[model samples]
Target: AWQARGLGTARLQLVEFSAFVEPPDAVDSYQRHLFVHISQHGAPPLESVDVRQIYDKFPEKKGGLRELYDRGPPHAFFLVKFWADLNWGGFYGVSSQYESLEHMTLTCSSKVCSFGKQVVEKVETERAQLEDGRFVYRLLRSPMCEYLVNFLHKLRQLPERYMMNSVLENFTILQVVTNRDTQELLLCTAYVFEVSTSERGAQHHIYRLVR
Candidate 1:
């Protein structure tokens, strides 16, 4: 039998584009960058020569360097960090969700100017009650928003092995802002989440505009 070895938690913050930025394009580009970085630097047997060469091959990608100035000002971003337990000699990594309710509250209010709607307000209210802890779930919309309210109310009644998956989905639009002076993308904000032993252990994060 294999023993459980704790792999120190890997925590990271994610940048959130503005409402003016194109969501599909930005997400695709970001995910591609993430995959490349994870595949190259994650665990070693990693070669500096190969890493440098790989970065050199992609000039447009800029080798994971974020161009905050290019994204413009009045920005918003999120940050997330966590620790994980890697089971020795096993593929599974158990992890504990990192809590940052305070940061989330401050960032959301400071950055998201357009989020003055009821749903956003509700989330703010619920967030205040979250002294315990919770994993990140998808963002909620109209009916989805209503459903989330009910779901939260039913937390205590849920079975020990309960799993919740929504049939409907909500989409968030993102806009990339650039700094006029530098002509670089201004990193507005970031969302941080994680991949744990179970796929569901990942947390949800959202960052919005400051002005």
Candidate 2:
């Protein structure tokens, strides 16, 4: 079996995006992990990646992104970095649905990118929270974002058993904010068991969005 990690008891922080940034959804948000998973699984870790050459290595994916681009565009450009494996014991991102694909791509007309890798050096949230009850999410890429919009369909599907990837698809990113003129937003994810609420939820799933 591929090596893996299980979600554990860790703290969670929620933040809101500003009007300048589009509210994330699968079509735009989910495909983000293409660069995410690749950087983790793909060679030439984040810092060393070359924007120009990234696509060449994954020709099959380029075709996919082309289709997305042809359909539409995004809000702006972003450079992203994530931990997929063997790094910091692997930072964890959780999600409900994602697939594993050999090749993938993402594109956004409103957004452009400098797609690259980044260790979870630090993350800043306008607000933070402690998740409670049973948390269920699907592992997407890492197992993987881009102004270069990739697709939930095209990006790699995670091995459901192990937490190998750095991404969590359908991982509800309920809020976002262009909170600052700050150049960077530092953040990371892990499992958590504590909650302030009295909801003793079951196999069923519940979601929240904080502003």
Candidate 3:
């Protein structure tokens, strides 16, 4: 889901050549379109989560969410592909904060596993540098990783029944920006899936390329 395909990067560069970037309000319009699309498609409903709230609870001494993101490692994105719907859902925030991946590891072993015990025990994810000069963390593709992937798929389907606390509070919708000029104002990162525990299940996953 988080492919930084040169196509998007090149389009963004083309806009830069004109020296007339789109207004920030354009991002709001993009988000509106995303919201409507999700609503119409019966996908897992999304709500805009404030990073400041996540920061207030975590209490960083440095620059907060931006710093957490720029710091890397435990601060990473958790990507999950819902098999039934062929949609992705998971978190794109800090694992060291409220959404600990270490915690998820334990939860998977204790709660989500049927045959994925070893897979959960040896959980695999990778961090990569984006062409746009940022970074992202995602699960690697493999038969073994599929075990964990299927577990995530199940968790998203019935989030309220399993790991409700982890799924509900830590998940969020972040806008990926096409206009680098407004990077500071928005997440402006890559496409990613985040978990949502609402009764809507894992029907919908939304990502908008905000310009």
Candidate 4:
């Protein structure tokens, strides 16, 4: 079982750096390369997942999908990313109020995972510091904190300079700067979400440099 690498109700978003049309007849369809930004705060020491591994482990599900990726037009294969060291020495973003954190822990555990559309509420960047900065952000007291508290308490001295939820909302993102560059990932933070005014969006990053 790929349980060790599995995500818990991991949130996903669709992004396309470019687009192309499937070749000849192979599942011929207008395909935009699909890559998802996964926020599975379920585990720390989170490493990027390989699609082939998932396919091999869960042949019934991903096997077909993986084949589609390998044989389908010249599209790219699946990729699973996590917040390395709490920062992905790359670009990252916070979920919008619409695609905000949906609490599905217990719901998913019982095998009742269902998807639905909700009216995304409008949220103003009440206190957005999306730009690069220092380590002064704080975690909230909601489902978003389920897999986060442990990391926060482990910190010797904590902080960051990312999105500050000025909306009085407990949720927030961090500064665009990097992390401590240590093997200890502070907050696996990158997430995917939608908004009342945006596409199924995301914030993807990984901290390979460590500093």
- In terms of lDDT, the best-performing candidate is 3
Residue 54, candidate 1: how far off, in angstroms? 29
**How do the residues 1-211 of candidate 1 rate in per-residue lDDT, one tens digit apiece?**
1111111111212212110112245445631111001110122221112122222211222212133323433222222122111111111111112232232321111111112111232221112224455322112111223333343335323343222111111211122222234343423222221222332322232223222
Ranking, TM-score, top scorer first: 3, 1, 4, 2
Q: On residues 25-90, what C-alpha lDDT tens digit does candidate 2 reach at each position?
A: 644544222112211112221122222332321122332222222322211111222222221112
Q: lDDT order of candidates, best first?
A: 3, 4, 1, 2
Name the better of 2 and 3 by lDDT.
3
**Between prediction 2 and prediction 3, which has the larger TM-score?**
3
Candidate with better TM-score, 1 vs 2: 1
Alpha-carbon lDDT of model 1: 0.22
Q: What's the true lDDT of residue 3 in model 1?
A: 14
Q: Candidate 3's residue-wise lDDT over 1-211, tens digit each?
A: 2333211231221011000112246545631111111211013322233333343332233423345455432212211222122123222111210111111111111112221111122322222334344333222222323444454455546624445334423332222221123222211322123333343333333222211
Q: After the best TM-score superposition of candidate 1, give how far the Cα of residue 78 lies from its true spot, in angstroms.
A: 6.4
Poorest lDDT segment (10 consecutive residues) of candidate 1 = 32-41
Candidate 3 deviant stretches above 4 angstroms: 1-49, 56-65, 68-141, 144-201, 205-211
How many clashes in each candidate? 38, 50, 6, 19
Q: Pick the candidate with the highest TM-score.
A: 3
